Amino acid sequence: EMEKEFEQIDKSGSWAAIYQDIRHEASDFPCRVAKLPKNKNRNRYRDVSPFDHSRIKLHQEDNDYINASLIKMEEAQRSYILTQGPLPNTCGHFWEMVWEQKSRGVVMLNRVMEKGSLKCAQYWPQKEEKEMIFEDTNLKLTLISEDIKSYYTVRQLELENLTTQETREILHFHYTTWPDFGVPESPASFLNFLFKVRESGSLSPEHGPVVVHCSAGIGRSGTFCLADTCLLLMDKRKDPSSVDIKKVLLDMRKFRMGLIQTADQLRFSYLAVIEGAKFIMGDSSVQDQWKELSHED
Numbered sequence: 695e696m697e698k699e700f701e702q703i704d705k706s707g708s709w710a711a712i713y714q715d716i717r718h719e720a721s722d723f724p725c726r727v728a729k730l731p732k733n734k735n736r737n738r739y740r741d742v743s744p745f746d747h748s749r750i751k752l753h754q755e756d757n758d759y760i761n762a763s764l765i766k767m768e769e770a771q772r773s774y775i776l777t778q779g780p781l782p783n784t785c786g787h788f789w790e791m792v793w794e795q796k797s798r799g800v801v802m803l804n805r806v807m808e809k810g811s812l813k814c815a816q817y818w819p820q821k822e823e824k825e826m827i828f829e830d831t832n833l834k835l836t837l838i839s840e841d842i843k844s845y846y847t848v849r850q851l852e853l854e855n856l857t858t859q860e861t862r863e864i865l866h867f868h869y870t871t872w873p874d875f876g877v878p879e880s881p882a883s884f885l886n887f888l889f890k891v892r893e894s895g896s897l898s899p900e901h902g903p904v905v906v907h908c909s910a911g912i913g914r915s916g917t918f919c920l921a922d923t924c925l926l927l928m929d930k931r932k933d934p935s936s937v938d939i940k941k942v943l944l945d946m947r948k949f950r951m952g953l954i955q956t957a958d959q960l961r962f963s964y965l966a967v968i969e970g971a972k973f974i975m976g977d978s979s980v981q982d983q984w985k986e987l988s989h990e991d
């Protein structure tokens with residue numbers, strides 16, 4: 695049981711030791727294409743790269759590389775694309791990936807600037823009347839509307855392939871309150887957001903994989919995907935107590951390195967899965983509880 699494990703670890707002050715063990719047991723796979731000198735300007739951080747076996751390939755003639763990985767969770771029957779926050783020169787590639795992979799939703803877990811430092815490029819339009827054109831990948835992006843809440847904003851974007859004139863509606867789910875240091879005090883806001891993303895239809899199997907990112911696409915993004923997958927498994931096994939969060943995280947780590955960046959994010963992932971479990975288990979009023987607890991106004 696994850697609840698019993700959570701407490702044993704918590705009371706013995708062993709989060710750092712459990713996290714250290716996950717880092718040590720994690721898979722090691724080649725990072726070859728990401729390290730090619732030609733791709734240096736496509737990586738935000740030199741120590742965060744997609745493995746060759748699961749990297750997303752752009753359907754680009756000259757260079758198919760993007761720092762993004764396909765996390766294919768077999769048992770949970772869900773796939774996620776985790777990528778770094780796009781750089782000024784990779785915003786076109788980012789939207790190209792979204793188009794090619796047929797993604798319906800984009801989940802952003804950070805702010806463009808945090809503690810005075812740039813963490814992600816301004817890749818979507820902030821004003822309806824000032825659309826963005828990505829010349830390199832021949833894409834047009836327009837802000838259609840935006841619903842700003844106290845801890846997240848949901849935007850309706852229109853992505854157009856200028857080559858075929860085909861148009862698609864992309865939903866942008868932006869968590870705007872991750873703390874400058876550490877992790878949120880409570881997982882209520884994070885869970886309300888996760889369920890808003892589920893409710894939108896963006897994680898459905900009829901669409902391509904949701905695109906999730908933070909700055910490196912491994913810590914906050916890993917937290918979001920780990921919690922979602924754990925919750926899916928708990929609803930699928932129907933005996934949620936067999937879900938081993940450490941084992942789920944290690945399967946996810948076969949697809950992208952360093953998912954879950956600190957012991958505090960691991961602890962927070964347990965907290966979010968344990969609390970989300972209360973809804974999955976049957977509490978029909980707990981979703982309203984997070985709605986209020988997260989104080990969306």
Ligand SMILES: CCCCCNC(=O)[C@H](Cc1ccc(OC(C(=O)O)C(=O)O)cc1)NC(=O)N[C@@H](Cc1ccccc1)C(=O)O
Pocket residue numbers: 738739740741742804813908909910911912913914915952955
């Ligand atoms: C798990 C591997 C990461 C280990 C520590 N690295 C760093 O913090 C960063 C990479 C990094 C990893 C996770 C992060 O997550 C947070 C976020 O996305 O906001 C979050 O989840 O809140 C943010 C950054 N790397 C550099 O800062 N890289 C620098 C310094 C550096 C130079 C040479 C070698 C390694 C690092 C660079 O120039 O690329």
